[PDB]
Structures are given as structure tokens and as C-alpha cells.
Design a protein around this ligand. Structure first.
Ligand SMILES: [Ca+2]
Lengths: 171, 171, 172, 173, 170, 170, 173
């Protein structure tokens, strides 16, 4: 679509699909582009994703944390698994959801190849997810481990109360 | 294509297919872009939709309510399921249909993934749909509960009488 | 390429089966042309076997809604919803080329219509509203239209003028 | 690409079977060119094995309706509807190159829709084709009836003497 | 591949595939475009073609002869059947091949049902031989024999035969 | 896509897939283009790759070493097989990984029969090992050992191993 | 989109099997750059496992024909027709990168060659002309080349220089 090109001028990135390497490459490239345009101005990352690959999600995570600009995260529909992980990873005080957004932190995948899955288990990237979520939500590692194994769906309000977002955007 | 892009210049968006995640993302992006262009001028959402997925439809709904410009809604052919919900969700006074439009309130999937179905069951989106509809139509939620469970087809004039739209546009 | 250039001349071509995509595109073009200039005429050329009635009504309603006069010109053919849109053009401004073939017969499902669309038509009785508009725009009685839209009667351009479906056959 | 640049030169290329898609494309180019300038000649090159008669009649009628003269020029082939459209050019301005192959035989051809085939027979389009061909070749309807019911191939010079075209374009120098 | 539109600015046309109706329509369109742009300047037609449809080849042949500009023909790799025919059809004195080009005048075709019927009733095989005779300076009798056999010709032998005017030497 | 052309203006090259011939040709072309634009300014090569073909990987490797501009390598996500080899081949002091990047040096990615035959005859594994040994500061004995096993490394471990120079801290 | 931009720098990339499509592309780019400037060098980068000899001879002939010098650089692999086009660069201007792989073997006859192409190869004895050309350009005896062309002969960049296939190995800096 020609629309996502216009939105880059507004420093808006839409993450509206399952997260695989292709998507990760696209989002990362968009993040580096906007940093090159203007290293100071905020970026707006709208999220409607059911999740996906963990190494691909970490690629985006790492790029959000590395670049100079504050990356604002705004969930518009769903944020599950890596979707919700990236939602929580946005700039402090600047993580949002619309009132009818659905958030799940269950971390179960996502067209991941042999090499990726091998890396995940060997470098125990799941423990790294749990540890990062714990830091960014304030929850204990033990509560994070428990909830990421479970299939709990949170309303926007329940997501704020959990510490995944900062503010529910009520009209 | 080039017509919708040039139509976007007039702050017109066309919602003319079933609503899935792709469509929602597109409509949401278009709404955010038009807000970014001018935060004050009306937006015209044209609707010819058999409906689609609830979580996709709520993403559009939330965006309409979130943005500063008021989104005028106009049914040209059909609004069924989520299509009619979106029609009823336009700026008050600014909801329209052409004389031979067909509106159906019945909410039944729109290629909704199993994660989305689970979320909607758990978060009780169906009761929420009924409630929002009753607020936007002026009907009691009991009337809404009944009418959304049967397949009730309404003319543009009947949908006006029902409160789904404000006016039938005059030839 | 050619169609975007024609759009500048306020010319819209309807040269396929009418389904929802086509209807959405035709509706869009009509809206764009009204936004471009509200006073100048639009030229809708029709070569269509017909299709979906709900899609056709979407185009019909838009033609009647928009400000500019919409001229309808049949090239090749106008069957079912195709003939309905041809008869729906501005009065005094509905045309057919000499060898055009017009058919009023409304089938008994077309335009690869969805389950939801078929149900709406039978419940809201669109077949009767079609027959009503046709009689109003041709000058024939409702019982004449009712019989003719049930039959597979093919009309020449001149017979279609006699019928009231068009205003004039265009002279070479 | 090349075809859009050619359209600036008021050149239209008809190089395939005739269906509704092609007919609509040709019809639109003719209307565009008339909208550009209504006095200057149009140059319609024809290399076509034929196709749908109702699609063919749409092009035919459009040629006769617009104000500019439509010169027709056969390169390669003009069979069935192709040769009918060749014969449909502005009289005096129908051409073929020396090695062009013309066929007048009229055979539902070329992915014609079910409604179209029925329309052909009911409105008796075959009689109209014959009568028009007769009118613009100068040949009698009886001769055209016989010649269109046989697989009848003609050279460019034979097609000229038959009256289908006005001149064979012999190359310089 | 947008290289071909760039070459068109330099009045260069590439015929580097099997000759069918689509290729014919394409080549004919470029030739007409190049005449419209400028009717005086030479056009350069490069050939690497195994041949193809006789009626499609004839459409190209006629357009070459009909347009005002001189069309140079340059064989770069192969010119077989209709390919070699179109090579022999260039402006006189301006038909070339590169030193390692392969040229075959044997005529066996990627035509259609209607096209095949036309070729045989109108006797296009005789028209090919006749034109080959006119443009090579060879007799109808020799050409008839050679177009029936699978004689491959070097670039030098094609010059000697009269299919080209000069071999293009490094 | 389309974003990648804009990134080229910033002298950024994304290597975010398996390395086959088409990918190598593309990366090599982007490197040559950027050198041609400016021979002095740094190039940034972002790597997210499972690796792939040895011949294709060496094509990129050689071009990185040949061109004038310093090529910075930045691992985002993963660098395995040729991916990690290309990561280790960045300009000295300008090889980086993000905190959560996964690095694997193990050498076993869609390559023709000719290429596989070439690899074993011309002893390309011995070449890889020697080059890795030269750019990490680890011995050939050590690198021969670690290339055989499926040892994954964190960004910090990759730095300690000598594959990268720094981890990029948020 | 880099290739079109790269073409502004007089750079051509041959990165696949050689067939008629590839050859017609390369030939076109060579002819384009001549028309652009006939004096400045052209840079042909080679990463090719070979292909059709007819297609390769088309490129070869065009390289020799045009005025600009064509520099050849092997980046990854040059096999069969790939090697041949490598050895065919301007004298003193044939290069390979240090880890390039070169094979002179000319296969059992490649690259989707048509029955017409294969017939011409055998009749016009195209293999003999290849061996003759390689001999002239490597400075080796036709006897040695005939032997090495019949074996699967993989060479390093340095060995290719010692053979005479290239003039220099491009040393990195
Ligand atoms: Ca720099």
C-alpha cells in the first residue's frame, strides 16, 4: 500500500501482522530510516499483532532500545505473545492501548527455522523474555513465568494494571 | 488503486469489502493519515461491507472515536454485521445511507484466528457490541439482543427509524 | 492508463460484469468526478452482461445522488443490471449505439453474489423495486416490466428507444 | 509503454483476438483521441485472427460514431472480425501491407459470454455483418453470403480488388 | 529490462527471442514509434532469434519496408528461419553479423490454427523464397533447395551467400 | 520494500535473509554502488541471517575487503554460518551486535552442484577457518574445533570470542 | 533497482546462468554504454556457473565489437562460459578477487539451449573455436586447453592468473 509510505513522514510505523523475519526486517529498517531522518522526534508504533517468532521479536526489541528517538507503542486491536512484549517495550510513559484492545502475554513458532529454534533453547531466550517483561512491568519473575505459561486475556485496563501499558486512550 | 489514493485527497475512505485484519489495518492507517493531514476537517467513510471479524471491526471503531476529526459514515450498498456497527458508529448527525441501501444488524467470523475467537469469548465482546449499539441507536439493549440474534434486514428508511443512521440522503 | 486519462474527460467505462469490486470502483469514480467538478456532465459508457443487484443499486443510487448529470451510452450490450443502469441515466441523455443489444431480463444469484446479498434481495424484495423503477423511467406499466424481465427478450437499439430504456439512438 | 507514446501520435494497435476486454480497450482509446482532437485522423493498425462479433460491433459502431477519420492498416493478419474492422475504416483510407493475410469467413468465438451468443442469433447479427460488408466493399449481399460461409483466404491485392481495402502500401523507394 | 526503453532513445531495437504474435506486435510498435520520433534517422535492429511464426515474421518484415527510416539489421548470436529472413530484410549495405554469429535459412513455426491455414493457401513459403532471392541475389532454385535443408552458415558464409553485407570485425 | 532504497541513501545495507547467489549479487551490487557514490564514507551492513552458500558468502566477503569504504557490521537478531563469518569480516573496531543477538560460527544453503564441487576441491573450509582465526585472534586449532560443534553465543560471548568488537548498549 | 543505478557507473553484473535472455540483456547494456560514451572503460562483474555457448558467444562478440574496453572481474565463480567471458576481457584488465573460483571445463553438449542452438554448435564446430580463442587469450597451446577443457578443472584466483585466464588478482585494501 502507498499509505504506509505517507505515514513514515508522520513517523508512524504500523505493525499489523504476525511477526516473522520479513516483518522484523521491515520494522527494523523503518526504525533506522526514521532515526536517520530525525534522531530527536518521537516514533509511533501501532501494534495489531498476534505475535510470532521470538528472535524476530527480539530484533525489533533491540532496535527500539538502541535508537535515539522515543518509540511510542499503541495497541489498536490485539497484542499477543511477541505483540504484547513489543507493546511493553515502548518508551516509559508512552505505552498505550485503545479501549477495546486485547492483550495476552502468553509466550508459546511463527515460521521459525531449525537454526532459530535451536538458538532459542540453547541461549535460553525464554528466560530472557521473562526477565525483560519483569523489568518493564514490575512484576516478579515468578509471576511473569506463571502468566506467560497461562492463556490469560487482558482488557486494556487489565493491561495497564498489569504494567504492560501506561495509559488507556479513552476518547 | 490510484482512484482511492486520489479520493483520499478529498478525505474520503472506501470500506467496500469484508473486514479482516488487513482491511482494518488499512482503514486505521488511512484514518490516522487523514488526521495527520488535517485534524479538523470531516472524514467521509463509505460503507459497502458484509461485515467481518469483531476484533478487526473494533480496531476501526476505536480509531474513529480516538481521532479528532469526526468520521461521517455513508452506506452505499450494504452494511451487515460489523459493517452496520461501523455505520452506526459515525459522528452523531452524520450517519447516512442511500435510499436502496440494505442494512442488517445480525452479528454471527471474517477469517478470525483462534486467538481472536478466544479473546472475544473471554472479554465478552458480543455483549459489548449490543451495549454500544443500544447507546448509538437509542434502543434498549433488550431490543438489540433480540434483533442481532435473528437475521433482520432493514431498508435505509427502517434503519433511520431504528436509529442506526440519522438521515436517508435525498436524490 | 487509458481509463485514468478518460477520467479527466469525465468519462467512466463500465465494461464488465457488475460485482461489488466493480460497483465500488464505479461509485468511487462518480464521487471523484463530483469532487472534481460538481456542475459538468459525466459520461458513463456501458458494455455489461449485468451482475449483482445490490452492486447495481449501489451504482444506481450514486448516479441519482451526485450533483452532475450522468449520461449513459450503451456500446456492445446492456443486459440485466446493465440495462437498468442504462435506463437510469439522466433523462434526455440515455443513448445506445446503432448495433447495441439491450436485455431487460433480470435473472433468477448473479454477479457471483454472496450468501448475505441473496438473502437481502429476497427479504427486502428488490425484484419489485427494480420493476418499479424501470416502469417509472421507461414510462411502461409495472405489469409490462414484470412480464418482460421474466422473459429473455433481446432488443435492438431502436426497440430499446421505443421501450423507453433510452432516449436516442446515436447517428453515425 | 510504447503504446501510450503511440497514442500521442494518434496510433492504436489491435494485435490480438477480439474479446470484450480488447473491445473496451480499443473503444476507450478512440474516445480519448476524439477528446484530444476531433478533426485529426486516427491510425488503427490491425493484426488480428478475429473474435467476438458483439465485441467487434462495439469497435465498429465506435469507429462510425466518432468525428475523426479512422484509417485502418492491416499488418500481418485480418481474419473474421479483424477483416470486418479492416473494412470498417474510413473509405479511401483502408490499407494493407503487401504480405498481409485477409480472411472474410465468419465462424461464439473468442470467449464470448453465454448472453452474447444468444443475442447474436436473436438479433440476427450475421445478417447485419453481411449487409454492412456488402455496403462497404461494394459487393452484393449474395456474394458476401457465399464468401463468408467458406474458409476464404486473400492476399493484400486480392483484398483490394474485392473492395475490403482501398490500397496496398507498396514500400519506398 | 528498462534497458530496452533506454535503447529505444538510441534508436536500437532488440529481437532476441522466438518470433510470435506478441513479439511481432512489440517490434512493429517500436518501429512505428521510432518513425514517429524521427523519420530520417537510421533504426538499428539487433537479432538473436531461433525464428518462429511465418505470419508474425512477415508483419515485422512489412513494417521494416514500410517505414521511412532505414533499418539496419545486426545478427549478434543466431538468426534461424524467420530470424535469418528478417536479417536479410535490412537496408541494403546495412545488414551485418558479428564474427561468431550462426545463420540458418532453413524454413520448417509458433503460429496458430488460422495462421497455419493462411500460410498454405496463400503460399507464403513461395513469398519467402522469392524475397530471399531478391535480397541475396541468389536464384529461386538454389534458395528452394537450401531452405529445405538444415544448412548452418558462419558469418562469413552468410556474407558470401548475400544474407548480410559485411561481417563486423573487432 | 521501497524502504531499502531510502536506506541506501544513508549508506545502509540490510542482509536479512539466507545467503544464496541472488542475495550475494544484490549485496555485492549495493556495496559497489555505495563505493561509486562515495569511496570514503562508511557503509553500514546490518546482518540478520542464518547464513547459506559458501561461494555466495565469499563473494560478499571479497567485495567488503576490496572496496575503499570501511564496512561496519551490525548483528541484529542472528548471524549463523556465513552470517557470522560476514559479521566477523567487518572493519576492525566496527563490528557490533545488539544485546540480544544470537551468533553461531558453526559451518555445515541452496547452492549448485558446481559450487559444492568447487568448495571441496579448492579447500574453502580451510580458507574460512584461517580467516576466522585471523580476525578473532583465536587459533586455527580452536576455530576448527568450534566450527564443528553447534555452539551458540550471546552478544557478549561473541565479543569475548573476537567475532565482534563491541555490544551496542541501549 | 541497483543494477539500473549501477549502469550509470558503467558497471554490468553477470550473476546467473547464461541463456539467451541474460545474453540479450548483457549485450543491450554493452550497447547502451557504448552509445552513452564510446571511450570510457566498462566493468563486467562475473559470478556465473556458465550456460549456453550461443548466448556466451553473443556477449563475447559484443565485447570485442564495441569501442570501450570491457574490464572483467570475477567476484565469486566463473565456470565454463563464465570463465570464457572472464578470459575475454580487455588485455591487462581481467581480474578475480582472492577467493574467486575458476573452472575452464566446457561441459557435455548447457543453459536451456534449444535444438536449433545445439545443432549449430556441433555443425559449425563451436567447441573448436572456443579452444582456439582461449589459446590466443591465455597464451597457452591449443593442445593443453583441449585437455583442460575436457576435465573438471577448478582453479584459485592465483592459478587462473598463472594459467593466463586473468591478468591480476585484486589484492584487498
Ligand atoms: Ca563516514
Amino acid at each position: 500500500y502507498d499509505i504506509y509510505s505517507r505515514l513514515l513522514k508522520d513517523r508512524i510505523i504500523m505493525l499489523g501482522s504476525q511477526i516473522d523475519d520479513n516483518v522484523a526486517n521491515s520494522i527494523v529498517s523503518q526504525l533506522l530510516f526514521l532515526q536517520a531522518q530525525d534522531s530527536e522526534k518521537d516514533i509511533y508504533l501501532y501494534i495489531n499483532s498476534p505475535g510470532g517468532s521470538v528472535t524476530a521479536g527480539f530484533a525489533i526489541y533491540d532496535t527500539i532500545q538502541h535508537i535515539k528517538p522515543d518509540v511510542q507503542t499503541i495497541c489498536i486491536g490485539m497484542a499477543a505473545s511477541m505483540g504484547s512484549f513489543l507493546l511493553a517495550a515502548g518508551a516509559k510513559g508512552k505505552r498505550f492501548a485503545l479501549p477495546n484492545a486485547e492483550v495476552m502475554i502468553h509466550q508459546p513458532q511463527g515460521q521459525a527455522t531449525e537454526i532459530e529454534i535451536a538458538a532459542n533453547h540453547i541461549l535460553k531466550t525464554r528466560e530472557k523474555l521473562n526477565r525483560i517483561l519483569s523489568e518493564r512491568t514490575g512484576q516478579s519473575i515468578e509471576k511473569i513465568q506463571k502468566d506467560t505459561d497461562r492463556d490469560n486475556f487482558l482488557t486494556a485496563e487489565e493491561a495497564k494494571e498489569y504494567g504492560l501499558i501506561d495509559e488507556v486512550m479513552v476518547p
